[PDB]
Amino acid sequence: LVEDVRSGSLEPEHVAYIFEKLEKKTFAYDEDEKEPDYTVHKSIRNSVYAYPEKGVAFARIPYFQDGSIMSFDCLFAVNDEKMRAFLEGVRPRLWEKSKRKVTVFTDGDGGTSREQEAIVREVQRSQVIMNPLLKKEIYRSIDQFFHSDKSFYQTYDIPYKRGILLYGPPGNGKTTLVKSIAGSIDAPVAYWQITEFTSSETIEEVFQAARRLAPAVLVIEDIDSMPEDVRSFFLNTLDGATS
Amino acid sequence: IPFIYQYEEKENERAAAGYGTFGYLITRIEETLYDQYGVFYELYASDDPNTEYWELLVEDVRSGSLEPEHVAYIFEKLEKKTFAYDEDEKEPDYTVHKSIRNSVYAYPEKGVAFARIPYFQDGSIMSFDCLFAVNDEKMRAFLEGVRPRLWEKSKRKVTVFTDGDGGTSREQEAIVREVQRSQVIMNPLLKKEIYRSIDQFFHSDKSFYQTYDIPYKRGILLYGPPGNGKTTLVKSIAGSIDAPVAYWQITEFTSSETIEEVFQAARRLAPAVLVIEDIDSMPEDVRSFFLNTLDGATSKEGLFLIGTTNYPEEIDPGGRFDRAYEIGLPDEELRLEYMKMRGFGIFLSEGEIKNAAKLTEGFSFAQLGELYVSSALQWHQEGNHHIETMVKDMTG
Amino acid sequence: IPFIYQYEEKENERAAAGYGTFGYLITRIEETLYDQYGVFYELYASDDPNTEYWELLVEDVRSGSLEPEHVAYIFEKLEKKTFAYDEDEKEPDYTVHKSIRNSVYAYPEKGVAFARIPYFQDGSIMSFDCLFAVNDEKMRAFLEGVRPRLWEKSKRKVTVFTDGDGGTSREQEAIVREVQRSQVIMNPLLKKEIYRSIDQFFHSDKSFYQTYDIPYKRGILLYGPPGNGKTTLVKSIAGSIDAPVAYWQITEFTSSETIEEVFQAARRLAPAVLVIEDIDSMPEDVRSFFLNTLDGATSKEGLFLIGTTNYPEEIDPGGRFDRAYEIGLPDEELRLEYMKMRGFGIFLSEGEIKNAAKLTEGFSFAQLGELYVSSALQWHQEGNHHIETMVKDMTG
Amino acid sequence: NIPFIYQYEEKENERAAAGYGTFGYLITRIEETLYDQYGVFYELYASDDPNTEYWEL
Amino acid sequence: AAKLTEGFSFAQLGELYVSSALQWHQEGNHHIETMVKDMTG
Ligand SMILES: Nc1ncnc2c1ncn2[C@@H]1O[C@H](COP(=O)(O)OP(=O)(O)O)[C@@H](O)[C@H]1O
Description:
Distance between the termini of chain A: 28 Å
Entry title: Crystal structure of Bacillus subtilis YjoB with ADP
Chains A, B, C, D, E: Uncharacterized ATPase YjoB
Oligomer: part of a larger assembly
CATH class of the domain at 102-243 in chain A: Alpha Beta
Bound molecules: adenosine-5'-diphosphate
CATH superfamily of the domain at 102-243 in chain A: P-loop containing nucleotide triphosphate hydrolases
PDB class: hydrolase
CATH topology of the domain at 102-243 in chain A: Rossmann fold
Organism of A, B, C, D, E: Bacillus subtilis (strain 168)
Keywords: AAA protein, chaperone, hydrolase
């Protein structure tokens, strides 16, 4: 909803303000986010929004408690049918949005942290200098996986999953090849940043998150740096193929 | 003798905070249930800490079951509807139904009724969970019925416990693969021996254990070289048992605290299969305590334990499990069973599968699976399967 | 269908807690700004979490800048004055000025205004930070102006990040030593090569990076034997750059969490120099992640990195920095530059310094400094400098 | 002209700021007391001073 | 330059580029051959 309002999308309409003397506008600008968004739009807090086509409406109702300003997130629908269809439409909406952002999971102390970024230098496939046959075979497995439709994985009861590993002397195009794939496929790309805080709890969160994004590419740079006490669990998580 | 405080107060100030709203709602809930069922319900729990039968209530309403009836809404302008959809669950549930919070439900035949009374405190919306019954006997019969209902519900699911830093986390899973006993590819003599215990434990009359005076617990260990498909075999056996199945994932966070938690939770589903995924990953400092929860002086009954290890001696020196069975890699007979099952006959005549079983000596089930994908892909891509060519390519 | 709760209430009880005071103050702040500026300010943030432009407001008032005007006090009997003095800061600021809390300020030309509304809760005095603007376009232009103002302010400072157990701690420092490029004592060919990149990055038009399509980041490493003055050299180069300078102190508390924090903070000052004091002290478990924040797939631009190490191989096997330059100990030419600069000519004729540069082969800059104090002390104490005597005393 | 959900018009009493009535009275009385004893005017420079050193002095 | 850089990684060719472009932009020369040595050094 916030992104729809922020982007000037047509489909949510502003219906009313709740309190006359609380905020009527807001801005995206968060000094804690790496990318600064300076868009100014109508407030989310203290407003009512509706998706008339969908029969769903949002009200973020402010109230005063312990000094600070808080809000209830109230959700309204016209009937049960329209509410269910709205909810069933969230995963596909988020899938489309994620095709055009890059999702990064970074393992921190508590658990993993998810940020959506845009890539700083797009790398076109044509700028990836490589043995043309090696290059065509890598790009072809990726392109065939998402876009040739999978009569194969269905007729033979084989899990719809693939993994390739890039290795070699440093400075010769592993990261470059990976960056080139983000741009050039019609599916989300996610990066998993392994850290010293990578744990079995953290591997569980990334794969539950990644799989909600499926079909997608999950990139794991420097997979050698995965801690020893979670390698077993990680293998068991890959074999959790049903999901 | 003197009293420092000598203020005497008007009786309007003897009023008890919060009681005026609460007693008014309890009175109304009782009146409304009487109006609808002609009996008198009594409060048995003011803010019930028990979660089990409250989660049965929610599943009963969610699933459109007839047994709990919506009686009343509490507040006119709070929610009358709700949905199961939580974004933090693996499997999303988009069912829309009447709200639980802000509602009164009754199991009329059972004579017990539930009310989630909303209230505002600290600018979040909370609830008192209130439980009513028509009398003590019905209250007790309801409580005694809870674990049996939980047991049937969990037959239809697999419960996975994963040890984390706070404790173990319980996730339920739908059984999307039904496994019949004929699909358990395994040495047929140990298949026979192990199912002797399994069938007594889960699929027969339980009088046997009383007749021969035998403890109602068992624990077996499956060991052997890596790659012989042990974990896939245990999940096959577990899926053929008509009883709730639980998996316990040892992690780096496994402590004596997560052990007690998981065993207590599995035991609530007794009789149940508890599968111990790779008992090797268990920290050495809890191994002594772990075996003492199997066979120590205060150990309990109700569980059929099945573990898997590649290093049998590291876990249980000697035996504190009941039996340990070695899983080797499959002989020609088992190989053929696998290839017929796995789907090789899609693109292989009967002779070609008999032949391929012959040529795959020393293959693990895993490698027979990696062979399956390869011959299948060539068959799909080209219309040719070169089994003969690909066994050799896999050897060297 | 029934409702349990049937109390219907007087409309005086639909009143929203806290809103009566708050809406009254917002109305008055808007009225007072209108009374003074003839325009209508609107609330854009009720309790603004952003700190950056609030700290510019405080520095603007502290520094007697003309740009923000004091409009009104909120409460008559709360503070009208305040002072910068906090006893927990390294450098004390004793400036006395009008209060921030309990005041309304406006940038009239910018069309945005600030109010810190005091309030009592839990027996401490807190505030709502409230932000107003005349329209969306001015609000946005104000926000877009923040980072540029922060950038100029930080040119005049050195920002030090020290990793601690909670996270990294940011302290600002006044630049008390201005360093010109002629005081950077260094091998003149690498001085020339390195400043080639530095001057393109900070002191030229940035179109170069677009023309040749080159990523707007650089990272260099300075290595060599201990005692060759590496850290003193980097601080010399850093102080000659017209851009905010940040120092990052690796400690035993350095984690992948403090790394991301510091890089994000340095990047907010982009373009900026980030000096990495002794990258050797970095824990091995974060080294892999550290280099991935330099050159991984999601690495960002805007920073000129300068590190120092005595063990180059331990950090970056191979190169994920861009260039590594070796700092040896100074030849006779560099020695002479140092001795003229350090102040030897105070008590040395021109020949004696030329001679002393000759006799100090194999001296580190540090040792030339330890020589400086000794000859200076004798010269001050006695009126004699026995350079000749003291080089030998230092050799053996 | 966008409607407002909340249309309750507030009494003049609801605008009172919690705890300010006591605090302002005390501050004013302290000011008057300091004036009555020294004939100079004192004002607040800190409502709840976080600094301890000169308080410990 | 392609034969003078036998054994170079792409990343080192990229540093050769940045260094050459800098010298070209700032001085009108490129010194491609001196730089190849400077980097093997
Ligand atoms: N195959 C390549 N094609 C184009 N540029 C490359 C290639 N390999 C390396 N580079 C350049 O060198 C830099 C580092 O390469 P990278 O892809 O990170 O190598 P790796 O990840 O294999 O160590 C890249 O940012 C790119 O500028």
